[PDB]
Amino acid sequence: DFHGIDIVINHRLKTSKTVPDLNNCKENYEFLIKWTDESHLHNTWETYESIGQVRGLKRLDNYCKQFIIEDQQVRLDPYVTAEDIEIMDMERERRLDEFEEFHVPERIIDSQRASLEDGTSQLQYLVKWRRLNYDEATWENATDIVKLAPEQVKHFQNRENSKILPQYSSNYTSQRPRFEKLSVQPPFIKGGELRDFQLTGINWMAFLWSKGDNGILADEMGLGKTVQTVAFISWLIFARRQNGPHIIVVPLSTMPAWLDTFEKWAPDLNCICYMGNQKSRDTIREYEFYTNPKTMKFNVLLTTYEYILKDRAELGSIKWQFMAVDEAHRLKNAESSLYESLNSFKVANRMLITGTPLQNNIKELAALVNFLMPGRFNQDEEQEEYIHDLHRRIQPFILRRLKKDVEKSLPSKTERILRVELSDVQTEYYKNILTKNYSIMNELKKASNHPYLFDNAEERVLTRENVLRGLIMSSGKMVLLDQLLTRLKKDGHRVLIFSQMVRMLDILGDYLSIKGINFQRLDGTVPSAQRRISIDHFNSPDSNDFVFLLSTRAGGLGINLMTADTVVIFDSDWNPQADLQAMARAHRIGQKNHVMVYRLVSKDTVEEEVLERARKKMILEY
Amino acid sequence: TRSSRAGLQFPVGRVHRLLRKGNYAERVGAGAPVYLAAVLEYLTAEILELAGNAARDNKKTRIIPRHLQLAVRNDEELNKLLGRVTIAQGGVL
Amino acid sequence: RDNIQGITKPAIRRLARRGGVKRISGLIYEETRGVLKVFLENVIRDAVTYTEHAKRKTVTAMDVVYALKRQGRTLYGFGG
Amino acid sequence: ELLIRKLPFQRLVREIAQDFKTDLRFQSSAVMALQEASEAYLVALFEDTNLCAIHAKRVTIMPKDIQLARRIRGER
Amino acid sequence: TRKESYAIYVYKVLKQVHPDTGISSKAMSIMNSFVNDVFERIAGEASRLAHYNKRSTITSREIQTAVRLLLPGELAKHAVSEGTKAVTKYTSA
DNA sequence: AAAACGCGGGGGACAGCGCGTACGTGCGTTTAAGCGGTGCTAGAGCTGTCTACGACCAATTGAGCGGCCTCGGCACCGGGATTCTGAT
DNA sequence: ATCAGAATCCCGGTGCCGAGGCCGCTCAATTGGTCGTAGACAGCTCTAGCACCGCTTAAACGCACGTACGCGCTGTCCCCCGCGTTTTAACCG
Numbered sequence A: 001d002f003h004g005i006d007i008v009i010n011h012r013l014k015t016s017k018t019v020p021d022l023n024n025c026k027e028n029y030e031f032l033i034k035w036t037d038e039s040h041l042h043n044t045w046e047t048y049e050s051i052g053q054v055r056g057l058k059r060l061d062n063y064c065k066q067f068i069i070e071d072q073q074v075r076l077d078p079y080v081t082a083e084d085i086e087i088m089d090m091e092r093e094r095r096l097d098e099f100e101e102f103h104v105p106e107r108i109i110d111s112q113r114a115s116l117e118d119g120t121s122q123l124q125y126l127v128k129w130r131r132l133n134y135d136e137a138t139w140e141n142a143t144d145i146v147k148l149a150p151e152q153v154k155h156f157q158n159r160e161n162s163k164i165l166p167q168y169s170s171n172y173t174s175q176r177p178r179f180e181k182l183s184v185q186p187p188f189i190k191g192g193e194l195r196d197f198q199l200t201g202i203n204w205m206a207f208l209w210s211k212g213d214n215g216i217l218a219d220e221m222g223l224g225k226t227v228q229t230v231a232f233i234s235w236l237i238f239a240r241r242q243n244g245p246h247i248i249v250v251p252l253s254t255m256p257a258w259l260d261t262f263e264k265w266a267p268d269l270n271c272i273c274y275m276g277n278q279k280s281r282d283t284i285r286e287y288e289f290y291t292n293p294k295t296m297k298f299n300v301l302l303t304t305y306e307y308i309l310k311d312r313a314e315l316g317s318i319k320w321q322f323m324a325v326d327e328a329h330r331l332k333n334a335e336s337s338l339y340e341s342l343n344s345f346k347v348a349n350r351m352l353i354t355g356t357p358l359q360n361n362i363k364e365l366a367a368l369v370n371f372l373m374p375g376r377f378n379q380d381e382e383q384e385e386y387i388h389d390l391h392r393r394i395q396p397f398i399l400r401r402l403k404k405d406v407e408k409s410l411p412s413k414t415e416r417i418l419r420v421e422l423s424d425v426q427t428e429y430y431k432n433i434l435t436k437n438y439s440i441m442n443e444l445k446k447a448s449n450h451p452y453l454f455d456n457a458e459e460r461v462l463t464r465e466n467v468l469r470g471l472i473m474s475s476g477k478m479v480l481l482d483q484l485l486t487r488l489k490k491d492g493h494r495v496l497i498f499s500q501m502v503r504m505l506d507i508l509g510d511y512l513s514i515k516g517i518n519f520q521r522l523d524g525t526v527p528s529a530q531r532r533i534s535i536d537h538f539n540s541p542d543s544n545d546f547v548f549l550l551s552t553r554a555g556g557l558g559i560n561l562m563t564a565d566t567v568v569i570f571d572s573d574w575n576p577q578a579d580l581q582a583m584a585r586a587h588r589i590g591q592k593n594h595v596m597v598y599r600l601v602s603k604d605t606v607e608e609e610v611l612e613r614a615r616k617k618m619i620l621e622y
Numbered sequence B: 001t002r003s004s005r006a007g008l009q010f011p012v013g014r015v016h017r018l019l020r021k022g023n024y025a026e027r028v029g030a031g032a033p034v035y036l037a038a039v040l041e042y043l044t045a046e047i048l049e050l051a052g053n054a055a056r057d058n059k060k061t062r063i064i065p066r067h068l069q070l071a072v073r074n075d076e077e078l079n080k081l082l083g084r085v086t087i088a089q090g091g092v093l
Numbered sequence C: 001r002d003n004i005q006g007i008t009k010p011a012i013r014r015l016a017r018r019g020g021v022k023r024i025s026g027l028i029y030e031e032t033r034g035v036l037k038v039f040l041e042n043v044i045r046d047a048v049t050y051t052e053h054a055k056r057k058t059v060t061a062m063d064v065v066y067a068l069k070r071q072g073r074t075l076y077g078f079g080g
Numbered sequence D: 001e002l003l004i005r006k007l008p009f010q011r012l013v014r015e016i017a018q019d020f021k022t023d024l025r026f027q028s029s030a031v032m033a034l035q036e037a038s039e040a041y042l043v044a045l046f047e048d049t050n051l052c053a054i055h056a057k058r059v060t061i062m063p064k065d066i067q068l069a070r071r072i073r074g075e076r
Numbered sequence E: 001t002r003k004e005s006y007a008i009y010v011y012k013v014l015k016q017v018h019p020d021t022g023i024s025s026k027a028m029s030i031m032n033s034f035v036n037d038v039f040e041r042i043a044g045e046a047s048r049l050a051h052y053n054k055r056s057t058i059t060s061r062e063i064q065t066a067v068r069l070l071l072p073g074e075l076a077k078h079a080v081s082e083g084t085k086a087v088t089k090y091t092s093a
Numbered sequence F: 001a002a003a004a005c006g007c008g009g010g011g012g013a014c015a016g017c018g019c020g021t022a023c024g025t026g027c028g029t030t031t032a033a034g035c036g037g038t039g040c041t042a043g044a045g046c047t048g049t050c051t052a053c054g055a056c057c058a059a060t061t062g063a064g065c066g067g068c069c070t071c072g073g074c075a076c077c078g079g080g081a082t083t084c085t086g087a088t
Numbered sequence G: 001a002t003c004a005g006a007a008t009c010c011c012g013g014t015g016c017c018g019a020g021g022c023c024g025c026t027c028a029a030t031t032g033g034t035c036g037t038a039g040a041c042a043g044c045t046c047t048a049g050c051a052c053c054g055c056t057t058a059a060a061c062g063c064a065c066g067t068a069c070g071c072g073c074t075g076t077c078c079c080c081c082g083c084g085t086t087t088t089a090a091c092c093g
């Protein structure tokens, strides 16, 4: 409402000691501020005397203090080492690059005309910038916007005067026109190089749509299921003129991947990402509908499970023609509030995507089938027939493809289990938690993995040397991890480590920081932006990171991890399907390195039982 | 049914059953359960009436903890009856 | 921190405002944690005694209600 | 709505019960009852304490105020 | 399974006193626990009184004295009156 | 033996006035926490069998209750020593 | 710094009532047996409330600022003490 400091970009010396004082900062150093309710590119150099008394000064002090401490421990501190400065200028340049890209627009929302002090009815563009949700969206000058990105303004104009709007979407639900078995890429798909199996899947799902019933894309993780989804959305919106809104609900951390896929295989098609705070939602409500007492313009709306649950009611009004769920494994619980919410959603056709269709128990497969098609769905020898008749019944409604039969270029997958000996400290903790007075199966798992997980196990085993020797020698699992990490570093390989516990990941991060390896971490507590930065860095052509720390399912459900060769699973997650789904994060079609999977198991512990019983779940897949 | 013939809404028979099974005395009079059911019905009717009045004052068709607690605490009578009592999810007067 | 400090200064604040307190002294908070601490010791002691008698390894809402009823503040809502 | 704060209260209750017994395993309803009772007690006590301050010609409650309230209640 | 609660009866009284209003599971639990508390209190009083009078039976006059002691006043007369109408009409049939 | 009136008198109430510690109040961060969702498996909560346990009943008797009767011990008194108390 | 004047206090004397013992014979105790059935025990199926992790975001923490009130000090003047004196209600045969 009133101009004032909101974010600060960077610093500099106005004109050419260890701890700058307040006067030293105020006079010599000068700061590039952003003003509130302004674009992120309308920045300006500023100094205390010029800004005067204005809100945000506390943030000017907080950033300046961060700058002073940074200048203290870059090199003028007594302790200086090459790794330290490397991390400092690395984080510095990353922050610079992110803020530099915060300037350029990503999309334009609307154009409005307003009289200025001079009376000109100059046009103004509301513009969303890259790496921002629709919150903090400002009306920028039309002239500046067209100069800065004429291409985006062209896409904007095409969007507002688009021949693909929902409002005259055809209504073929009375009888769906019969299709023709496609043998070539339709010219609509502007990504190119669609695979033969992907065409077969598109035609399978089109035949199923035409017949009217629904199905689950059960192709195993890493066969371009997202690309098939985008191709079929374009197919509905072009071949069948069903312009009307579609909803894609995807796990978070894969939403940017879905924007990339939609834009690169269908640039003309409009998609709206639906996340951010309540202001982001409100700025979406400003645009997704018209100010009138109703039509949808957005061709597709992308969102996540949490946002579906939160805005169930408000989205529930919108007549959806195609609702597609990615990674249909959170829909395996009938009681799940997402299950109830999606049933409550008013949807013409539902599609499910999952690398792993059949989960731990047949009840989950039954629940998935029922939510696909509601109302349409022991002794050993009777069971042997019954499973097969249920399977035969669902084969027309399921499509699954194996990486071995098709995509021969995908190198074979090798998985190996390494039985590890429990160290002395782990054994001691183990016997302690088989009794009381050391001062649940979880505690066995923690003790088997690594004793630092416990509250005050630091003193029990324990300069720079001492901490590292303690951490390595405390777990035989970690000792084998050292041998493999050094071997892979010698071989120039890249690794990603799947740990169930966030504390396991924290222990790994402290270890790798101490030993000096550069890594990248992705976890549930990580905000969406910096997760995307993490994935972009690890996937860039140049990558000084050799280790990717991951949870079992935050980065092991739907994320893309091109350019990794080794997957080290610390422990099974009680679900072999989820273990496989994490394992297929490096066995994508885009891998020419013959991924090898090392699963670490402690001997004479709970993990042997865990594997022996996950074996039962594997046998039930048949 | 003893309650239905009684024209009281409370179970005279089950009150008698609990008085027998509660080790209260070896024999229970015929009129004691009847009288106790009558007083229980009366107190419930009074409290429910007050709760409904509070709900009307709050323009709500639904009687919630705050309605019941507000009734009990505004009314001096029930307040002295249940002064050293706390109603779950109940707000302050 | 230790979970006695889990009862946060804003929580103590909201309690006081509900009870009608206009201002709270900084020394109030420690002692509120203290009285909360001793009351919980009493009620949990009676509840655990109830379970131990019942050969039940799970504190039950009926046990909590019975404990409170003896201490002199009957709790309605969780009856069974 | 409830104001003594859920998970902090549950953990406080857990360590309090830890001293009286080990491998003791609460119920959700039991935790709710405990929190509601403690809420009621503390609101009553702050009402008393504010009476005490108002009688001492003070608007801000004090340690001495809450100790007065307690030692007239009698648990102290 | 058969659960010991005053559900249907509180519903019946509530529809009698306020036909439009309804009560949910939680508030029924509040009413049920309250009625159980009042009823336990009255029955304990009656048993204690029969004991102190060395009388080994319970009856409407026991409950008379219990209700009169427990209810603070200005519903004591009402509770006595409705209980008495119930017990005379019982002893008739 | 206690209550009730009355007088002067000291002590302290109550109000005012000042200063300064402490308080509430933003300002946003970092924190943690609903409110979903995972996989357990401790341990209910329930049933069924069968034993020792306990409730009633005579028959036998020995601890308790009321009545009765002594005499230590407590309350009582005067007189004598102890004592905390201003008052100047 | 001191000692006079009330109250408190030490001892022991005499008188009276209740405590504590004894006695009888009342009543319920204590074996001794029998029968029924409540609980211990064993066993099963199934609940539900762990342990943690997402994810968003309300809430808590820290810090800084300004000023309303806590506590102290002083001053005056109402309102009780603390007798002495005069009623008065009570005292226990």
Ligand SMILES: Nc1ncnc2c1ncn2[C@@H]1O[C@H](COP(=O)(O)OP(=O)(O)O)[C@@H](O)[C@H]1O
Binding pocket: A192, A193, A194, A195, A221, A222, A223, A224, A225, A226, A227, A257, A326, A557, A558, A559, A560, A588, A589, A590
């Ligand atoms: N034909 C293709 N051309 C280019 N990239 C592809 C193709 N097929 C798949 N990919 C890439 O593979 C990645 C993974 O797709 P997939 O694992 O099947 O689904 P999801 O992305 O939902 O996990 C996508 O991010 C996509 O970029």
Ligand code: BEF
Binding pocket: A220, A221, A222, A223, A225, A327, A355, A557, A558, A559, A560, A584
């Ligand atoms: F197919 Be996986 F979920 F990327």
